[PDB]
Amino acid sequence: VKSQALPFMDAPAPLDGSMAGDKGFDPLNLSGSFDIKWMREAELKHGRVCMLAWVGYVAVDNGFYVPFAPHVSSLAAHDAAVKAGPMLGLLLAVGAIEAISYNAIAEMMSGETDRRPGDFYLDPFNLCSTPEKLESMLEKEISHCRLAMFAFSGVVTQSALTGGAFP
Amino acid sequence: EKSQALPFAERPAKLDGTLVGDVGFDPLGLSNILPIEWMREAELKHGRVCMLAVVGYIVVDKGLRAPGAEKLVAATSSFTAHDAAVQSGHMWALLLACGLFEIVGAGAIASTLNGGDRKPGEFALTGGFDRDAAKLERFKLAEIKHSRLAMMAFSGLVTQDALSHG
Amino acid sequence: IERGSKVRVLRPESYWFQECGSVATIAKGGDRYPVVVRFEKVNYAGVATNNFALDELGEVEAP
Amino acid sequence: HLIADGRPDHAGEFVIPAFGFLYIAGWIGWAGRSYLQFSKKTDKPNENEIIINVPVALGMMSGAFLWPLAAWKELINGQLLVPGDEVTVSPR
Amino acid sequence: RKPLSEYVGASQELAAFPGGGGKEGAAPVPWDPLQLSELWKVSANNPDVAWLREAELKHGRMSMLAITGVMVQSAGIHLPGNADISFANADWAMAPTTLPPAAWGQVLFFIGLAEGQTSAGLFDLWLGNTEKREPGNLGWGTQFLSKDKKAADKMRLKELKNGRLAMLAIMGVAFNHVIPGALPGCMY
Amino acid sequence: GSVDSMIGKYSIKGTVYDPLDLASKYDVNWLREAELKHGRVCMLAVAGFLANDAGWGLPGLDIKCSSIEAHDRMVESGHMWALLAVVGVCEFLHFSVVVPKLDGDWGDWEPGNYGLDPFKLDSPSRREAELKNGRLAMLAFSGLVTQAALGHAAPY
Amino acid sequence: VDRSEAADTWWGDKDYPPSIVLGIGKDVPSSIFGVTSGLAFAIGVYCVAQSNLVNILSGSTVNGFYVAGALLVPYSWGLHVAAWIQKQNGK
Ligand code: CLA
Ligand SMILES: CC(=O)O[C@H]1CC(C)(C)C(=C=C/C(C)=C/C=C/C(C)=C/C=C/C=C(C)/C=C/C=C(\C)C(=O)C[C@@]23O[C@]2(C)C[C@@H](O)CC3(C)C)[C@](C)(O)C1
Numbered sequence: 001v002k003s004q005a006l007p008f009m010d011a012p013a014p015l016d017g018s019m020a021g022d023k024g025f026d027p028l029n030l031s032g033s034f035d036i037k038w039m040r041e042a043e044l045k046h047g048r049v050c051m052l053a054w055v056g057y058v059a060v061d062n063g064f065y066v067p068f069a070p071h072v073s074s075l076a077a078h079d080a081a082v083k084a085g086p087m088l089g090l091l092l093a094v095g096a097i098e099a100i101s102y103n104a105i106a107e108m109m110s111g112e113t114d115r116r117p118g119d120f121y122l123d124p125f126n127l128c129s130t131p132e133k134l135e136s137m138l139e140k141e142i143s144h145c146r147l148a149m150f151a152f153s154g155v156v157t158q159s160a161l162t163g164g165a166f167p
Numbered sequence: 168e169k170s171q172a173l174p175f176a177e178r179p180a181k182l183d184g185t186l187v188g189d190v191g192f193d194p195l196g197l198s199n200i201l202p203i204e205w206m207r208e209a210e211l212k213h214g215r216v217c218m219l220a221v222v223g224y225i226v227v228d229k230g231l232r233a234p235g236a237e238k239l240v241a242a243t244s245s246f247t248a249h250d251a252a253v254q255s256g257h258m259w260a261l262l263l264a265c266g267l268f269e270i271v272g273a274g275a276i277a278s279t280l281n282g283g284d285r286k287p288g289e290f291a292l293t294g295g296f297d298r299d300a301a302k303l304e305r306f307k308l309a310e311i312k313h314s315r316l317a318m319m320a321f322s323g324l325v326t327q328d329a330l331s332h333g
Numbered sequence: 334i335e336r337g338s339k340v341r342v343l344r345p346e347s348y349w350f351q352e353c354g355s356v357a358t359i360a361k362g363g364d365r366y367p368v369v370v371r372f373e374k375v376n377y378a379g380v381a382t383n384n385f386a387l388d389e390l391g392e393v394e395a396p
Numbered sequence: 397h398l399i400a401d402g403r404p405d406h407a408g409e410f411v412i413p414a415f416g417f418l419y420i421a422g423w424i425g426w427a428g429r430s431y432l433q434f435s436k437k438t439d440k441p442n443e444n445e446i447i448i449n450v451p452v453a454l455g456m457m458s459g460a461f462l463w464p465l466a467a468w469k470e471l472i473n474g475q476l477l478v479p480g481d482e483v484t485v486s487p488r
Numbered sequence: 489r490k491p492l493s494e495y496v497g498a499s500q501e502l503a504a505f506p507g508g509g510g511k512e513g514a515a516p517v518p519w520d521p522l523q524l525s526e527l528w529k530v531s532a533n534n535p536d537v538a539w540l541r542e543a544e545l546k547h548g549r550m551s552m553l554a555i556t557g558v559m560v561q562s563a564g565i566h567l568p569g570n571a572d573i574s575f576a577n578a579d580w581a582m583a584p585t586t587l588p589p590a591a592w593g594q595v596l597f598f599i600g601l602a603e604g605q606t607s608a609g610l611f612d613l614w615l616g617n618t619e620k621r622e623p624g625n626l627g628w629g630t631q632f633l634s635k636d637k638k639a640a641d642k643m644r645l646k647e648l649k650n651g652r653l654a655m656l657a658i659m660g661v662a663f664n665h666v667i668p669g670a671l672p673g674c675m676y
Numbered sequence: 677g678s679v680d681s682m683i684g685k686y687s688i689k690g691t692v693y694d695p696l697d698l699a700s701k702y703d704v705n706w707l708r709e710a711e712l713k714h715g716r717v718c719m720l721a722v723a724g725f726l727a728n729d730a731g732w733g734l735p736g737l738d739i740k741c742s743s744i745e746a747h748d749r750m751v752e753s754g755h756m757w758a759l760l761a762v763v764g765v766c767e768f769l770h771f772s773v774v775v776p777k778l779d780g781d782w783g784d785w786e787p788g789n790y791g792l793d794p795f796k797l798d799s800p801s802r803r804e805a806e807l808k809n810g811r812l813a814m815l816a817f818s819g820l821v822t823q824a825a826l827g828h829a830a831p832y
Numbered sequence: 833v834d835r836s837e838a839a840d841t842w843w844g845d846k847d848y849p850p851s852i853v854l855g856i857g858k859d860v861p862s863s864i865f866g867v868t869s870g871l872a873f874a875i876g877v878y879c880v881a882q883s884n885l886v887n888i889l890s891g892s893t894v895n896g897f898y899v900a901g902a903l904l905v906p907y908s909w910g911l912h913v914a915a916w917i918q919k920q921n922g923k
């Protein structure tokens with residue numbers, strides 16, 4: 001309806017309180033423009049990557065390392081790991097998951113499967129049993145996704161700027 | 168019939184008093200060519216930009232600095248503060264903030280051109296002054312008059328400062 | 334269409350397809366192609382006449 | 397070596413002979429077409445095709461000198477290009 | 489389709505003789521020796537008189553701006569300049585060759601935007617369908633046309649005559665700039 | 677819209693001065709408008725010619741030159757460009773009000789009535805004086821320029 | 833794709849294409865299409881000029897960003913045709 005976070009206009013058509021984190025924030029009609037399931041999957045994927053990125057950046061800068069590491073600050077750790085080699089192995093490992101994700105996205109958007117975006121059915125302890133748990137955890141996940149996007153953007157920009165300690 | 172501002176000149180077709188501040192002043196007739204909602208949003212935006220710009224110019228010229236701006240090493244005459252600030256890279260922050268707000272501005276003008284019924288320049292940022300519709304209309308006409316004054320005020324201020332080259 | 338009339342042939346396989354001919358005779362019942370159109374442009378065989386049905390002819394000028 | 401590229405320095409090589417031939421060939425074709433238009437209305441067009449009516453053939457040949465204006469006039473009046481809905485066509 | 493006779497193009501200059509019968513700068517009939525206006529009857533491939541009038545007015549307007557630019561530029565009048573740009577060049581043929589691309593790059597691409605944004609239904613004009621488009625009526629300053637039919641026709645006729653004259657002038661100076669000696673007595 | 681119902685006839689004799697009969701050949705209101713504008717421009721022009729030749733000052737000016745040859749040098753200096761801009765704006769306003777009117781219907785614009793009347797000094801005799809002074813200014817400025825361009829100068 | 837599973841995209845009886853031809857962008861408005869097309873044209877022509885016209889290309893100077901941005905010029909053409917199609921379809 002008349003959107004939240006832009007109280008002088010209405011949220012685009014897809015935003016109708018259907019999905020988690022729907023604060024009615026899409027002023028440009030950029031999700032009524034193109035399918036919002038793809039948009040939500042992209043949002044979730046960005047958020048997960050940035051959660052992992054922030055926590056890994058902080059750990060490496062604090063001093064967390066592997067049995068054989070270059071033992072370098074997390075800024076130059078990209079170049080060090082690439083020159084060592086295992087970063088390309090990480091590329092292959094994530095490429096396997098990304099090709100399976102190509103498949104999953106195709107079925108989800110075509111309609112062969114009733115898959116929610118960013119839902120790989122990874123629930124070992126059944127932490128989302130009842131629907132109330134499902135929406136609560138999806139809401140928390142999306143809020144953390146957005147906040148971690150911002151967090152890693154700030155961390156990496158600041159590190160590339162000053163080249164200082166952890167903060 | 169005949170224009171309020173130009174009783175010798177005929178009234179423009181689109182200008183009919185619906186928009187506040189209308190006196191039928193349009194010899195060139197650009198209103199009939201461009202949509203009008205875009206035009207009045209542009210008028211509000213130009214007015215607000217120049218209103219804030221005059222205040223910023225005078226306060227920067229008088230001697231007021233922002234927190235930490237003393238190290239921006241400007242000539243303190245504003246006249247150079249533009250070159251100094253783009254060289255220091257802080258005007259890119261202003262550009263980013265303005266683009267962040269102008270995404271919403273583009274969305275809002277698209278909405279009112281589409282049919283959302285948002286009046287041009289409305290952004291729901293009111294300081295609790297939309298209580299009465301008559302007061303809101305009076306304030307809107309105040310804003311449009313102050314805009315029409317402030318555009319030319321900034322023009323005169325910057326042109327005189329440039330002729331001085333101080 | 335009418336005897337002594339100029340008619341454009343509309344049969345696709347005719348040598349005179351989309352061309353004019355003078356009607357000389359229209360027969361009664363019987364013939365599936367009652368009209369007898371006479372041309373002046375001999376086909377490959379040499380004949381300048383052929384029988385057509387009313388639907389395969391369109392008048393251009395009347396007698 | 398004749399330079400046929402359209403430069404006016406070497407116009408006499410092709411451009412002026414080209415215009416001369418185009419005028420002459422138009423004269424020829426217009427004389428032929430106009431005589432055919434005359435003969436088709438004759439009582440015996442088939443015999444007129446062989447035996448040329450020379451008195452009017454000379455007239456058509458002479459009158460074809462102004463073919464570009466005559467052809468343009470026939471074009472505008474629509475008496476040059478028969479509508480295709482009136483030309484024999486083989487079953488596609 | 490609307491015929492040529494209803495268009496504001498008649499010129500008294502052609503029908504200026506004993507028995508011409510022209511008045512107010514307009515001849516009783518339009519001029520068309522090679523009947524190009526009426527060529528659409530032969531085939532639809534050709535443009536209609538609507539397209540032809542649109543092209544005529546476009547050529548006239550462009551040629552008038554062009555000849556005015558030629559005259560002013562060759563007269564020595566030039567704009568202010570900076571270290572980046574110098575507008576001092578009398579030769580009107582190579583004047584655009586010598587100014588920064590933003591300069592001519594903003595002349596072009598904005599001429600290109602306008603010619604293309606104003607052009608809506610020009611193919612309907614080609615097919616002679618002026619349902620919602622008058623040829624030459626881009627909407628630029630149409631308010632200044634007199635409401636009287638006579639005055640409006642007079643004004644449009646003045647426009648057409650000036651456009652044709654300027655087309656002749658600009659092409660004369662062009663065809664004596666290239667192929668020298670075409671237009672005798674030309675200043676440029 | 678006719679010459680008969682207009683101010684500016686011969687004063688004493690009262691007849692209309694149109695020997696060549698040019699009133700009927702063009703819109704009479706346009707004739708009146710252009711006559712008034714020409715008279716006003718020539719009034720200003722002869723006054724300015726006299727002042728600049730006198731050496732009457734010009735607030736904030738730099739160069740001193742005779743009015744006969746001042747045109748080229750002020751064009752070079754750049755003041756005449758600004759004068760052209762101001763005149764162009766004013767005459768574009770007059771374009772907008774008058775042109776949509778030639779050979780047409782002057783709605784009510786009274787040829788020559790620019791509404792520039794703050795002091796309330798309008799009157800019929802003053803309009804007649806305006807027209808007569810404008811015409812004599814035209815002829816006088818013609819004499820001024822023709823005589824100045826041929827040497828003879830000063831009070832002429 | 834088979835003969836059956838294929839959209840009815842023929843439009844010879846109508847004045848403009850159906851929006852379905854645009855595929856994934858069958859719902860993005862004409863405003864977005866036009867603005868993106870204009871930005872794409874400007875950016876791509878800038879990249880091409882900076883790569884081969886303002887500078888001389890070479891093994892040591894070929895720039896990947898300019899090369900990629902060059903491909904926004906045909907994308908700009910497609911986007912502007914799309915803008916016209918959506919304007920005519922009413923979106
Ligand atoms: C009456 C004169 C006449 C006219 C107006 C045309 C017209 C045409 N012929 Mg040609 N044609 C003619 C006679 C004529 N033909 C004759 C007699 C023959 C048999 C040899 C041909 C065999 C022929 C072929 C095989 C082809 C054409 C083609 C064409 C077309 C292209 C022009 C060209 O390349 O000509 C080519 C000209 C010739 C091959 C030789 C022409 C013979 C002489 C020189 C001219 C006849 C004049 C005649 C005696 C005049 C009598 C009038 C007098 C009594 C007053 C055009 C429709 C071509 C086509 O279809 O293009 C679309 C094509 O493929 N024609
Ligand atoms: C923008 C907006 O909102 O509203 C605007 C838009 C709108 C409506 C368009 C408006 C307008 C009208 C406009 C702008 C009109 C502009 C008209 C213009 C610019 C008209 C030039 C004619 C030149 C000719 C005929 C030249 C002949 C030239 C000839 C015949 C020559 O002999 C040239 C010559 O070189 C030769 C060949 C030989 C040489 O020896 C030298 C000479 C010099 C002798 C308004 C009213 O302003 C309002």
Ligand SMILES: CC1=C(C#C/C(C)=C/C=C/C(C)=C/C=C/C=C(C)/C=C/C=C(C)/C=C/[C@@]23O[C@]2(C)C[C@@H](O)CC3(C)C)C(C)(C)C[C@H](O)C1
Nearest residue numbers: 713716717720724731732733734735759762763766767770
């Ligand atoms: C007709 C017409 C128009 C027009 C026009 C045009 C072209 C107008 C041009 C006007 C122009 C160019 C007007 C200059 C004035 C200069 C002045 C006043 C200088 C005084 C200077 C004085 C009094 C100097 C005095 C001194 O030397 C004294 C005496 C002795 C010294 O001790 C002191 C000094 C040095 C100070 C309109 C209105 C634009 C539109 C309408 O549609 C038609």
